[PDB]
Design a protein around this motif. Structure first.
Motif, PDB file in Angstrom:
ATOM      1  N   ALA A  11     -38.783  26.650  -6.957  1.00 58.84           N
ATOM      2  CA  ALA A  11     -40.107  26.436  -7.529  1.00 58.84           C
ATOM      3  C   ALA A  11     -40.113  26.726  -9.025  1.00 58.84           C
ATOM      4  CB  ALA A  11     -41.136  27.302  -6.817  1.00 58.84           C
ATOM      5  N   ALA A  12     -39.379  27.760  -9.425  1.00 57.00           N
ATOM      6  CA  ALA A  12     -39.299  28.141 -10.830  1.00 57.00           C
ATOM      7  C   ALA A  12     -38.896  26.955 -11.699  1.00 57.00           C
ATOM      8  CB  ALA A  12     -38.315  29.287 -11.009  1.00 57.00           C
ATOM      9  N   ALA A  13     -38.031  26.099 -11.161  1.00 55.91           N
ATOM     10  CA  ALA A  13     -37.568  24.925 -11.887  1.00 55.91           C
ATOM     11  C   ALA A  13     -38.719  23.965 -12.170  1.00 55.91           C
ATOM     12  CB  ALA A  13     -36.471  24.219 -11.103  1.00 55.91           C
ATOM     13  N   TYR A  14     -39.674  23.905 -11.249  1.00 58.58           N
ATOM     14  CA  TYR A  14     -40.826  23.024 -11.399  1.00 58.58           C
ATOM     15  C   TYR A  14     -41.719  23.487 -12.547  1.00 58.58           C
ATOM     16  CZ  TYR A  14     -43.710  19.270  -9.496  1.00 58.58           C
ATOM     17  OH  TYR A  14     -44.377  18.082  -9.303  1.00 58.58           O
ATOM     18  N   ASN A  15     -42.098  24.759 -12.518  1.00 61.49           N
ATOM     19  CA  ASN A  15     -42.951  25.327 -13.555  1.00 61.49           C
ATOM     20  C   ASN A  15     -42.236  25.336 -14.903  1.00 61.49           C
ATOM     21  OD1 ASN A  15     -45.760  26.608 -13.134  1.00 61.49           O
ATOM     22  ND2 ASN A  15     -44.720  27.034 -11.189  1.00 61.49           N
ATOM     23  N   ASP A  40     -39.608  27.245  -1.531  1.00 61.06           N
ATOM     24  CA  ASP A  40     -38.834  26.244  -2.255  1.00 61.06           C
ATOM     25  C   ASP A  40     -39.235  24.834  -1.831  1.00 61.06           C
ATOM     26  OD1 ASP A  40     -37.323  26.173   0.345  1.00 61.06           O
ATOM     27  OD2 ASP A  40     -36.514  28.053  -0.460  1.00 61.06           O
ATOM     28  N   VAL A  41     -39.205  23.905  -2.780  1.00 60.33           N
ATOM     29  CA  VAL A  41     -39.565  22.519  -2.504  1.00 60.33           C
ATOM     30  C   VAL A  41     -38.347  21.607  -2.587  1.00 60.33           C
ATOM     31  CG1 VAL A  41     -42.001  22.592  -3.135  1.00 60.33           C
ATOM     32  CG2 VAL A  41     -40.257  22.358  -4.918  1.00 60.33           C
ATOM     33  N   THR A  47     -38.186  15.747  -8.603  1.00 58.93           N
ATOM     34  CA  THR A  47     -37.906  14.440  -9.185  1.00 58.93           C
ATOM     35  C   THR A  47     -39.186  13.775  -9.679  1.00 58.93           C
ATOM     36  OG1 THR A  47     -37.813  13.663  -6.878  1.00 58.93           O
ATOM     37  CG2 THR A  47     -35.727  13.812  -8.086  1.00 58.93           C
ATOM     38  N   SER A  48     -40.289  14.034  -8.984  1.00 59.58           N
ATOM     39  CA  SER A  48     -41.576  13.456  -9.351  1.00 59.58           C
ATOM     40  C   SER A  48     -41.990  13.895 -10.753  1.00 59.58           C
ATOM     41  CB  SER A  48     -42.650  13.866  -8.340  1.00 59.58           C
ATOM     42  OG  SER A  48     -43.505  12.778  -8.036  1.00 59.58           O
ATOM     43  N   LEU A  49     -41.759  15.167 -11.059  1.00 57.08           N
ATOM     44  CA  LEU A  49     -42.107  15.714 -12.366  1.00 57.08           C
ATOM     45  C   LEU A  49     -41.114  15.254 -13.430  1.00 57.08           C
ATOM     46  CD1 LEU A  49     -43.989  18.902 -12.637  1.00 57.08           C
ATOM     47  CD2 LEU A  49     -42.212  18.656 -14.379  1.00 57.08           C
ATOM     48  N   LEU A  50     -39.853  15.122 -13.036  1.00 60.17           N
ATOM     49  CA  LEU A  50     -38.806  14.688 -13.955  1.00 60.17           C
ATOM     50  C   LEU A  50     -38.998  13.226 -14.347  1.00 60.17           C
ATOM     51  CD1 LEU A  50     -36.549  16.034 -15.362  1.00 60.17           C
ATOM     52  CD2 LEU A  50     -34.978  15.360 -13.535  1.00 60.17           C
ATOM     53  N   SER A  83     -33.947  18.841 -20.449  1.00 65.28           N
ATOM     54  CA  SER A  83     -34.015  20.292 -20.322  1.00 65.28           C
ATOM     55  C   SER A  83     -34.577  20.693 -18.962  1.00 65.28           C
ATOM     56  CB  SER A  83     -34.880  20.882 -21.439  1.00 65.28           C
ATOM     57  OG  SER A  83     -34.940  22.295 -21.343  1.00 65.28           O
ATOM     58  N   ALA A  84     -35.548  19.924 -18.480  1.00 66.94           N
ATOM     59  CA  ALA A  84     -36.169  20.196 -17.190  1.00 66.94           C
ATOM     60  C   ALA A  84     -35.213  19.884 -16.044  1.00 66.94           C
ATOM     61  CB  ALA A  84     -37.453  19.394 -17.042  1.00 66.94           C
ATOM     62  N   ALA A  85     -34.559  18.732 -16.123  1.00 65.88           N
ATOM     63  CA  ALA A  85     -33.614  18.317 -15.092  1.00 65.88           C
ATOM     64  C   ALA A  85     -32.531  19.369 -14.885  1.00 65.88           C
ATOM     65  CB  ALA A  85     -32.989  16.978 -15.456  1.00 65.88           C
ATOM     66  N   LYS A  86     -32.131  20.023 -15.970  1.00 70.34           N
ATOM     67  CA  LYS A  86     -31.103  21.054 -15.908  1.00 70.34           C
ATOM     68  C   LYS A  86     -31.548  22.215 -15.025  1.00 70.34           C
ATOM     69  CE  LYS A  86     -28.630  23.841 -17.686  1.00 70.34           C
ATOM     70  NZ  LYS A  86     -28.658  25.081 -18.511  1.00 70.34           N
ATOM     71  N   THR A  87     -32.820  22.586 -15.140  1.00 66.51           N
ATOM     72  CA  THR A  87     -33.370  23.682 -14.352  1.00 66.51           C
ATOM     73  C   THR A  87     -33.584  23.263 -12.902  1.00 66.51           C
ATOM     74  OG1 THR A  87     -34.649  24.177 -16.365  1.00 66.51           O
ATOM     75  CG2 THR A  87     -35.031  25.576 -14.435  1.00 66.51           C
ATOM     76  N   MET A  88     -33.978  22.008 -12.706  1.00 62.62           N
ATOM     77  CA  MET A  88     -34.216  21.484 -11.366  1.00 62.62           C
ATOM     78  C   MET A  88     -32.899  21.212 -10.647  1.00 62.62           C
ATOM     79  SD  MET A  88     -37.503  18.925 -11.531  1.00 62.62           S
ATOM     80  CE  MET A  88     -37.292  18.338 -13.210  1.00 62.62           C
ATOM     81  N   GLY A  89     -31.831  21.043 -11.421  1.00 61.21           N
ATOM     82  CA  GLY A  89     -30.527  20.779 -10.839  1.00 61.21           C
ATOM     83  C   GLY A  89     -30.421  19.379 -10.268  1.00 61.21           C
ATOM     84  N   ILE A  90     -31.179  18.449 -10.840  1.00 61.02           N
ATOM     85  CA  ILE A  90     -31.166  17.066 -10.380  1.00 61.02           C
ATOM     86  C   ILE A  90     -30.473  16.158 -11.391  1.00 61.02           C
ATOM     87  CG2 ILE A  90     -32.546  15.202  -9.413  1.00 61.02           C
ATOM     88  CD1 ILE A  90     -34.842  17.162  -9.113  1.00 61.02           C
ATOM     89  N   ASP A  91     -29.762  15.155 -10.886  1.00 64.00           N
ATOM     90  CA  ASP A  91     -29.054  14.213 -11.745  1.00 64.00           C
ATOM     91  C   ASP A  91     -29.022  12.822 -11.117  1.00 64.00           C
ATOM     92  OD1 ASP A  91     -27.062  16.933 -11.412  1.00 64.00           O
ATOM     93  OD2 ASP A  91     -28.023  16.613 -13.363  1.00 64.00           O
ATOM     94  N   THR A  92     -30.085  12.480 -10.395  1.00 67.34           N
ATOM     95  CA  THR A  92     -30.179  11.183  -9.740  1.00 67.34           C
ATOM     96  C   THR A  92     -31.620  10.858  -9.364  1.00 67.34           C
ATOM     97  OG1 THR A  92     -28.067  11.811  -8.701  1.00 67.34           O
ATOM     98  CG2 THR A  92     -29.029   9.689  -8.066  1.00 67.34           C
ATOM     99  N   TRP A  93     -32.555  11.278 -10.208  1.00 68.36           N
ATOM    100  CA  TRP A  93     -33.971  11.032  -9.964  1.00 68.36           C
ATOM    101  C   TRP A  93     -34.381   9.655 -10.475  1.00 68.36           C
ATOM    102  CZ3 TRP A  93     -32.271  13.247 -14.375  1.00 68.36           C
ATOM    103  CH2 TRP A  93     -32.854  12.827 -15.578  1.00 68.36           C
TER     104      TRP A  93
END
Length: 93
Positions: A11-15, A40-41, A47-50, A83-93
């Motif tokens: 969740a921290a990644a989202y905020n 956790d989500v 990905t929606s926020l990214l 910068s956000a994607a790095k915190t979310m740990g996503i690389d395919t949104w």
């Protein structure tokens, strides 16, 4: 690794992801809200926020040429969305 997203995202990644964008402004986040009091989500949520900011930033640097922008966004904006994607740990949104 690439071509693969995490089963879930803290969740921290989202905020933290939306927070960084707040520096310039949030189009979708403006109407939506962050995640609190949640274990956790799923990546689908982050990905929606990214993607929201990614597409939004694309319009910001619309006045600039394609050469003066990475992929489809200003280098300055790309750093924010990235910068956000790095915190979310996503690389395919």
């Amino acid at each position: 690794g690439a071509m693969a997203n995490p089963k879930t995202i803290k969740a921290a990644a989202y905020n933290q992801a939306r927070s960084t964008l707040a520096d310039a402004g949030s189009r979708t986040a403006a109407k939506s809200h962050p995640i609190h009091g949640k274990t956790d989500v799923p990546v689908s949520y982050g990905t929606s926020l990214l993607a929201a900011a990614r597409d939004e930033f694309r319009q910001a640097d619309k006045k600039l040429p394609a050469k003066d922008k990475k992929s489809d966004m200003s280098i300055a904006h790309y750093n924010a969305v990235h910068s956000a994607a790095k915190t979310m740990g996503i690389d395919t949104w």
